[PDB]
Design a protein around this nucleic acid. Structure first.
Ligand SMILES: [Fe+2]
Ligand SMILES: [Fe+2]
Ligand SMILES: [Fe+2]
Ligand SMILES: [Fe+2]
Ligand SMILES: [Fe+2]
Ligand SMILES: [Fe+2]
Ligand SMILES: [Fe+2]
Ligand SMILES: [Fe+2]
Lengths: 228, 91, 138, 138, 228, 91
DNA sequence: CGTACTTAGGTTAGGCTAACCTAAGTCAC
DNA sequence: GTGACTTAGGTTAGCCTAACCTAAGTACG
């Protein structure tokens, strides 16, 4: 599946991994973007040369000042696009991410500023993810969001009832799953019951308003909640 | 293909209207060629060369000669390549 | 720069047909600001992929598949222009250059939503008819 | 170093069968001086290409296609050895390492010429039978 | 068609082009070895880095001292293999080059020295090409070679009768053609009549002992003769 | 597969002949495993452990213990893995 | 408690197409 | 004699598989 802009997608993939609290290795980009190990190393070496990131001693990818600025720019365009697609155009909830993942590469700042006014200064995407780099456009007290905990960690800690706050970009990549989440009611601003499990690698059981479903460890890790 | 072959057979290009002896006409289409110059498009908006507005096309002689047009809010000069890419209905 | 080389060559050939200009490789070189060798090589690639043919008089003729793709791109472009002017409120002069990039990333799924939102438009803001609305089912 | 990885893995498995040794990936690691991960990855590739299978007891089993290719390499190897000793006069101890490289580049056309030149040999200079002479037509 | 050793084949292709009096450009390697422009530039850049050649301002490839030594080593193995294949093994004349083109990559100096003794200190390949680097093995008055002229240049100069002396490696790559040359009798040590032609890019007509045939300009350029 | 499964069923491995109580035997096959050590192959040639030569295999007890062999031009010690890869006919 | 193998994340060599360039030609009304 | 195009030889960006590595695990008599 075509990336439209390779550089911008590598940057946003590193950003996504930081938001999920995952160590941004080249191995993670290979999995996510379905590219070969050698391809990712060569493209990262090209981005390093252009000064958008650096490979550390422990080999985790570190964005430069320019890299982080560009990554935020792309992610801002992504979540403003998602807002436009949901609130104004009315594209179906499960299809919006894949559309927005293309639009992020072609949107000007000029339009971003027009979308901010049209959408009433939005701060979060339709999936509850905060919209960064709104200062750079020219636009609010940010929520602390330290109370937010990952569904996998809540489950391993003994489960309990919690309010769904964020569904990360990683989860949005599977439309069929996003349809399953919408049906049973694992969406932002809905209460769910997280069943207790023991140890990693085990699929977490969750009970929504309209039934329940199973989340994989990597999916559960990407869903953030506030426990009641 | 209404875009390539107009359904309205009365649609004529500004350059051809000028070379035929000018006339008052309604602006109908501004092609993608004209849109590629933003500064020109601003000038077209300012003097009132926009779809749904009447303009006066001044009669001209000779190819590679710029076409004078009068809009509601003043006049401007179109290059032959630009005037070719604007379509109008003569009243 | 162009986002999609193939789609921009197809739409450029479509633009020239609308202007009643003879679509030569020399015209694409001017419009897209590319060297003659680049245009001839890219047109040869598109001929090999069955999107157009170079005629005996040397004018570029879109195939069935070439025209179908050119219509698709132009339809997305003019619907994007309608959205950018009527809804988003981007300035009249800046809209085309925005819509020129958006035409390459818009799904038919969004096109059908824009047709409903904009009240079944038949022309762009610049009066140019929207082609291939048949192929959307609207 | 190996010239052809696939052919050397096949001939190494064939070697172990001749020695009455259980052909494990651990044996190929020792013989070819390669890491465990390397051998498992390369054997998985050869399994995918249908040259062998990993059994339940984990011993490597050549397929019909794998055995056919292994015989081909061994035949070229021992004919090369015969040529190198009987005709060229390379020293007895150096011949194997030379023949180990020659086995990857020799055509069946040359093999058939060597069979005539060497007077239809059935064994290598080291007494090892030459297999797949049937497949040459000799 | 597999090269067996990419580096050694790039070196020998540069050597071949020098023997044919052709400017060794990367474009020449691309068409000869049937590889893409980008592939050849990347492989040449890798050989340059290792110090086997350098790219001049006019872009022609220049072998380093190490590069020339390695190129000669490969070509020596090639023509000794060719000698062995013809004189001892008895492989058919048209099939010998392709075989020898693989063998050149796997033969040791140890075997080379044993082949020199076996073949009686040979100085030329079965196609009349001199065997270089015999000094390096430990082994002759070098023929002048200035009186040799290219069949294309003889034809453009008015043609005439001449003795076939060398068929270059370029010509040997086409077995079907080499079979045609053998039949009509355009082989080393045979007299031929070269028909006169006007200008480049024209196919040269030649008359052997057992009939005649047409040579392409690039083929005629690669066949060397001594005019009567 | 005469190479894998010997047509001559009397062919036995040097290590097995040694462990069974030794004996005089004719050297028949030296496997590719043995050939990979040139220094060893030289030593085998020197003392006369080559195809078509008779050798004396000394009786041995215990696995992972080197096999003593006597050739025409002296004797040498084979490793278990090496002695496994040499095949002989006991005469 | 080594022996055999897997898991995880690299590497270099050696290939590819798409898509841009210049310099210096040829072909045509 | 200028406009349109070809010939010739490059370039960077962005993909691939094959085939090597280490470090730190798991599984089994
Ligand atoms: Fe998203
Ligand atoms: Fe994207
Ligand atoms: Fe437009
Ligand atoms: Fe575009
Ligand atoms: Fe051997
Ligand atoms: Fe080998
Ligand atoms: Fe040759
Ligand atoms: Fe070769």
């Amino acid at each position: 599946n075509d990336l439209i802009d390779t550089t911008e997608m590598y940057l946003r993939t590193i950003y996504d991994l930081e938001e999920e609290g995952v160590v941004p290795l080249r191995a993670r980009i290979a999995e996510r973007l379905e590219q070969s190990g050698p391809t990712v190393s060569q493209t990262v070496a090209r981005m390093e040369r252009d000064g958008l990131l650096t490979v550390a001693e422990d080999r985790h990818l570190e964005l430069t000042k320019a890299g982080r600025a560009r990554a935020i720019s792309v992610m801002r365009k992504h979540r403003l696009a998602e807002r436009l697609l949901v609130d104004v155009i009315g594209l179906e909830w499960e299809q919006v991410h894949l559309e927005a993942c293309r639009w992020e590469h072609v949107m000007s700042e000029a339009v971003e500023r027009k979308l901010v006014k049209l959408l009433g200064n939005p701060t979060t995407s339709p999936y509850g993810n905060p919209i960064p780099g709104l200062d750079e456009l020219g636009v609010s007290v940010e929520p602390v969001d330290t109370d937010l905990r990952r569904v996998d960690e809540v489950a391993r800690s003994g489960g309990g009832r919690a309010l769904v706050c964020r569904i990360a970009e990683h989860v949005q990549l599977d439309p069929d799953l996003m349809s399953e989440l919408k049906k049973v009611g694992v969406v932002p601003g809905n209460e769910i019951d997280i069943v207790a499990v023991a140890g990693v690698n085990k699929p977490i059981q969750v009970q929504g308003s309209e039934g329940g479903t199973q989340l994989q460890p990597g999916i559960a890790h990407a869903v953030m909640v506030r426990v009641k | 293909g209404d875009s390539v072959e107009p359904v309205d057979t009365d649609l004529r290009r500004v350059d051809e209207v000028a070379r035929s002896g000018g006339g008052r006409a309604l602006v109908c289409r501004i092609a993608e060629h004209v849109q590629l110059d933003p500064d020109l498009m601003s000038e077209l908006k300012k003097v009132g060369v926009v779809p749904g507005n009447e303009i006066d096309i001044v009669a001209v002689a000779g190819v590679n000669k710029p076409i004078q047009v009068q809009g509601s809010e003043g006049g401007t000069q179109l290059q032959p390549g630009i005037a070719h890419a604007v379509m109008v209905r003569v009243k | 720069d162009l986002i999609d080389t193939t789609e921009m060559y197809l739409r450029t050939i479509y633009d020239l047909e609308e202007e009643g200009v003879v679509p030569l490789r020399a015209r694409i070189a001017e419009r897209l600001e590319q060297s003659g060798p680049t245009v001839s090589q890219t047109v040869a690639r598109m001929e090999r992929d069955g999107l157009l043919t170079v005629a005996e008089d040397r004018h570029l003729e879109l195939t069935k598949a070439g025209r179908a793709r050119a219509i698709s791109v132009m339809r997305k472009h003019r619907l994007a222009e309608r959205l950018l002017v009527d809804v988003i409120g981007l300035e009249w002069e800046q809209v085309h250059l925005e819509a020129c990039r958006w035409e390459h990333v818009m799904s038919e799924a969004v096109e059908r939503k824009l047709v409903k939102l904009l009240g079944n438009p038949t022309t762009s803001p610049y009066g140019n008819p929207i082609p291939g609305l048949d192929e959307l089912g609207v």
